[PDB]
Amino acid sequence: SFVEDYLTKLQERPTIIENPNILKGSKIFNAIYRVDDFVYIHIQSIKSEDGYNQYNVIEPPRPTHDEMEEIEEKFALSIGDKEPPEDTKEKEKLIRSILDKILLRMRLSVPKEYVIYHFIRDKLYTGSLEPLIRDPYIEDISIPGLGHVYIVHKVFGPMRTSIKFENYEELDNLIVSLSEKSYRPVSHNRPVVDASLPDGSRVNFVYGVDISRRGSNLTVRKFSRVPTSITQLIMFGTLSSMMAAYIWTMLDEGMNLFVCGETASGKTTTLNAITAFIPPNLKIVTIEDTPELTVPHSNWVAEVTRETGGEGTIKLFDLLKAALRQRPNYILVGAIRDKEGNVAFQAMQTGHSVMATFHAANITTLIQRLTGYPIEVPKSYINNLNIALFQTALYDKKGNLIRRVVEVDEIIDIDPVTNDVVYIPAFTYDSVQDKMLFAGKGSSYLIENKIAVKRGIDRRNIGLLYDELQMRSRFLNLLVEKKIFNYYDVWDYILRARQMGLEEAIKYVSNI
Amino acid sequence: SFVEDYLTKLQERPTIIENPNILKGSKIFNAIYRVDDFVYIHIQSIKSEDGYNQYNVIEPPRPTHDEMEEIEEKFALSIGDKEPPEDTKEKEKLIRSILDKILLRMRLSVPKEYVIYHFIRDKLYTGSLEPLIRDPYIEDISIPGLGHVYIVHKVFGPMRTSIKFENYEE
Ligand SMILES: Nc1ncnc2c1ncn2[C@@H]1O[C@H](COP(=O)(O)OP(=O)(O)O)[C@@H](O)[C@H]1O
Ligand SMILES: [Mg+2]
Numbered sequence: 267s268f269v270e271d272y273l274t275k276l277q278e279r280p281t282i283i284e285n286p287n288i289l290k291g292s293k294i295f296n297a298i299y300r301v302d303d304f305v306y307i308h309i310q311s312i313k314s315e316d317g318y319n320q321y322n323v324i325e326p327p328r329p330t331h332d333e334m335e336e337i338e339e340k341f342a343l344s345i346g347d348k349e350p351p352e353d354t355k356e357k358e359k360l361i362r363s364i365l366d367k368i369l370l371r372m373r374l375s376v377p378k379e380y381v382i383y384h385f386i387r388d389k390l391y392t393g394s395l396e397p398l399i400r401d402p403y404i405e406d407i408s409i410p411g412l413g414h415v416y417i418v419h420k421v422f423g424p425m426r427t428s429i430k431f432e433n434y435e436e437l438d439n440l441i442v443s444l445s446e447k448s449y450r451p452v453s454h455n456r457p458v459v460d461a462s463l464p465d466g467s468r469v470n471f472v473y474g475v476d477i478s479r480r481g482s483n484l485t486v487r488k489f490s491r492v493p494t495s496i497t498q499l500i501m502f503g504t505l506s507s508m509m510a511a512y513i514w515t516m517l518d519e520g521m522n523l524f525v526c527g528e529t530a531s532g533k534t535t536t537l538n539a540i541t542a543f544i545p546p547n548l549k550i551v552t553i554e555d556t557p558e559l560t561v562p563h564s565n566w567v568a569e570v571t572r573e574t575g576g577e578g579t580i581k582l583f584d585l586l587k588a589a590l591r592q593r594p595n596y597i598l599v600g601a602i603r604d605k606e607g608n609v610a611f612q613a614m615q616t617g618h619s620v621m622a623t624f625h626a627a628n629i630t631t632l633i634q635r636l637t638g639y640p641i642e643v644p645k646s647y648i649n650n651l652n653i654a655l656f657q658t659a660l661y662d663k664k665g666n667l668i669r670r671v672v673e674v675d676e677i678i679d680i681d682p683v684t685n686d687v688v689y690i691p692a693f694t695y696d697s698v699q700d701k702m703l704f705a706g707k708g709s710s711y712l713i714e715n716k717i718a719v720k721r722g723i724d725r726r727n728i729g730l731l732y733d734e735l736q737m738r739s740r741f742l743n744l745l746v747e748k749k750i751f752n753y754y755d756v757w758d759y760i761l762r763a764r765q766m767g768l769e770e771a772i773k774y775v776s777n778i
Numbered sequence: 779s780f781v782e783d784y785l786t787k788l789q790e791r792p793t794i795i796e797n798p799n800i801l802k803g804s805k806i807f808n809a810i811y812r813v814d815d816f817v818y819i820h821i822q823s824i825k826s827e828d829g830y831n832q833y834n835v836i837e838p839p840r841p842t843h844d845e846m847e848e849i850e851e852k853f854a855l856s857i858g859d860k861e862p863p864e865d866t867k868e869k870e871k872l873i874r875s876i877l878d879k880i881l882l883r884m885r886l887s888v889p890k891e892y893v894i895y896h897f898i899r900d901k902l903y904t905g906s907l908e909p910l911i912r913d914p915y916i917e918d919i920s921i922p923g924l925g926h927v928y929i930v931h932k933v934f935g936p937m938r939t940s941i942k943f944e945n946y947e948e
Contacts, residue, residue, distance in 0.1 A: 567922040
C-alpha cells in the first residue's frame with residue numbers, strides 16, 4: 267500500500283490515530299490520521315525554526331510526466347469536440363468511463379487506481395490542494411506566492427504543508443484553472459477575484475506577478491454550505507428575538523429592507539438569515555457578483571454577473587433591469603453600490619419587493635449615498651425603502667469580536683425643509699450592557715400606518731398586532747432554547763408556523 | 779378519453795367542474811376543468827409545507843421516441859432544404875398537410891390526432907409549456923432553474939405544476 271511504503275522511509279514510525287483531536291494541547295507526538303482512502307496525514311510534533319509544525323500529505327504515487335501527457339492527449343482526442351455535461355456527478359461518471367477505456371490498454375508505471383486518483387484529482391477537483399480541501403481539520407489554506415502551501419489547522423494552528431509551488435507559470439496556471447472551476451475566471455484586467463470552490467469554500471484569487479509580486483496567490487476559507495440561521499444570530503446576540511420577529515412581520519408584508527454596515531460587519535450573513543422569513547410560495551430573484559445567498563425557496567432564480575473584458579459583460583445593473591420582467595416577489599441584490607441602486611428603486615416603484623446589503627453606518631449616510639452620484643435615487647422615492655438596519659463589528663470587554671445590529675430605522679420621508687430624512691428608530695443598542703432596545707409599543711409607523719391599515723385594525727385594537735409580534739418573538743426564543751440552529755430546520759419550523767398558526771406553533775415546540 | 783385514463787390511476791376522485799372560479803377561495807379542493815380538447819387541468823390542494831398546491835397537466839399520450847423520430851425524419855425529407863413561406867398561418871396549414879401526407883399509412887401506437895397534437899405542439903408552439911399558455915386562468919409562468927415549472931393562477935395564486943426540467947442541457 268502507498269501508505270505503508272511511505273512509513274518505511276521514516277527515521278521512526280508515527281502512531282496511527284483516528285483523528286488529531288487527541289493530540290490537542292500535546293506537543294510530544296508523531297501521528298498519521300486518515301482523510302480519504304487516498305489521503306493520510308502525517309503530523310510532526312517537532313517545530314521548524316520558524317515555529318511551523320509540519321503537515322505531511324501522504325498520497326499514492328503519480329504516473330510519469332510522459333504517461334500523464336499521453337493520457338491527457340488521448341482523453342482530449344477522444345470526445346474532443348463534444349462539450350461535457352454540467353452536472354458534476356454525470357461529468358465525473360463520463361470522465362471515469364472514458365478514462366477506463368484509455369488505461370485498459372496501457373502499461374502504467376504505477377497501479378491503475380493511482381493513475382485514476384491523480385487524473386480525476388487534477389481534472390475535476392482542486393489538484394494538489396484537494397487533500398487539504400478534504401481534511402475537515404483544515405480551516406484555511408494559503409498559497410502566498412512561490413513556496414509551500416500554508417494552512418491553519420483546527421488542532422495545530424498554522425502549519426507548513428509538504429505541497430510546494432516553485433514555478434511562477436505553474437502557479438499562474440493553478441490560479442487561472444481554479445478560478446475557471448469556480449465559475450469566475452481571473453484576467454489581467456480583473457486580477458482580483460472572490461468566488462467559491464465547488465465544495466462551497468470561499469476563495470480569494472490574486473492573479474499575475476504584476477500585482478502579486480511573489481507569484482499569483484490564493485486563500486481558501488472553509489465553511490458550511492449551510493448558511494448561519496436566524497436562531498444562531500439571536501443566540502450570538504447579533505439581534506434579539508423581538509428584532510427578528512419584527513423583521514419577520516415586515517417581510518411577511520412585502521416591506522423593502524436594506525442591511526447596512528461596513529465591510530465584514532456581517533451584512534450578507536444577516537440578509538441570508540432573514541430571507542427565511544419571506545413566504546415560501548413566492549418568487550425570489552437573487553442578483554450577485556458571486557453566489558453567497560443560499561435561498562431555501564423553490565421558486566428561486568439565482569443570477570450572477572459576468573466580466574468578459576468586452577462584449578458579453580453583464581453587470582448587476584443589467585440583471586436588475588431584467589428582473590423587472592421576471593415577476594419576482596422579492597429581488598435580493600447581493601450588494602448595492604453603483605447605478606443598480608437606481609434600478610432597485612425602480613423595482614420598488616413597479617411593485618417588486620427588494621432587499622440588499624449596502625455600505626453605510628447610519629441612516630444619514632445611507633440617504634446621502636442613495637441620493638448622490640452615482641446612484642441618484644430621487645428624494646421623493648426614498649421612502650419606498652421601508653427599513654434600514656445597521657450592523658457593526660465591536661469588541662466586548664474581554665476583547666472578543668462580536669457583531670451587533672445597532673439600529674433599525676423606519677424610513678418615513680425626506681423633509682422638504684430641508685432635505686433631511688424623516689425616520690423612526692424602531693430598535694437601538696446599548697453597548698455597555700450589550701442589549702437591544704425596542705422603541706417600542708405604539709412607536710412603529712410601519713406597524714401603525716401600513717400593517718394596521720391593511721389588516722385593517724383600529725388604533726385601539728393595535729394591541730393585536732403587538733401581540734402577534736410578541737408571539738413571533740416567543741416562538742423564535744423557543745427554537746433557540748431547543749437548539750434548533752440548522753438553517754433548513756429553522757426554515758421548516760417557520761413554514762410549520764405558517765401552516766398551523768403561531769399559537770399552535772409555540773405550544774408545539776414547547777414540547778421537546 | 780385520455781382524461782379517463784389519467785383519472786383512473788387516481789385514488790381520490792377529482793370533481794369535474796369546467797370552471798375553477800367556483801373554488802375561490804377554498805383551501806380544500808380536488809377538481810378538473812377543461813382548457814381545450816387536448817388539455818384538461820387537474821388542480822388539487824395538498825398538505826405541502828411550502829404552500830404550493832398542485833397543478834397537474836393532462837394531455838394525450840405521446841407516440842414513442844422512435845415513432846416521433848421516424849416522423850421528423852420523413853418531414854425533413856419532404857421539405858428538401860426549402861425555407862418555409864413567410865406568412866405564419868399558411869405555415870401551419872402547409873405543415874399539417876405534410877403531416878397528414880406522412881402519417882397517412884403509418885401505424886402508430888397512439889391515435890393519429892394525438893401524434894399531430896404533440897408534433898405541432900413541439901414544432902410550432904411552446905412544447906410542454908403550451909397548455910399553460912392555453913389556460914386563461916394562468917397569469918405568470920416561471921422556470922427559475924432545474925426543478926418544476928411554477929405558475930401564478932388567478933384562482934389559486936402560486937402553484938407548483940407537474941411539469942419538470944431536471945437536465946441542464948435540455
Ligand atoms: N452575526 C455574526 N456573528 C459572528 N460572525 C459573523 C456574523 N455574521 C457574519 N459573520 C462572519 O463574519 C465574516 C463576514 O461576514 P459577511 O456576512 O460576509 O459580512 P459582510 O457581508 O458585511 O462582508 C464571515 O466570516 C462570517 O462568517
Ligand atoms: Mg457581504
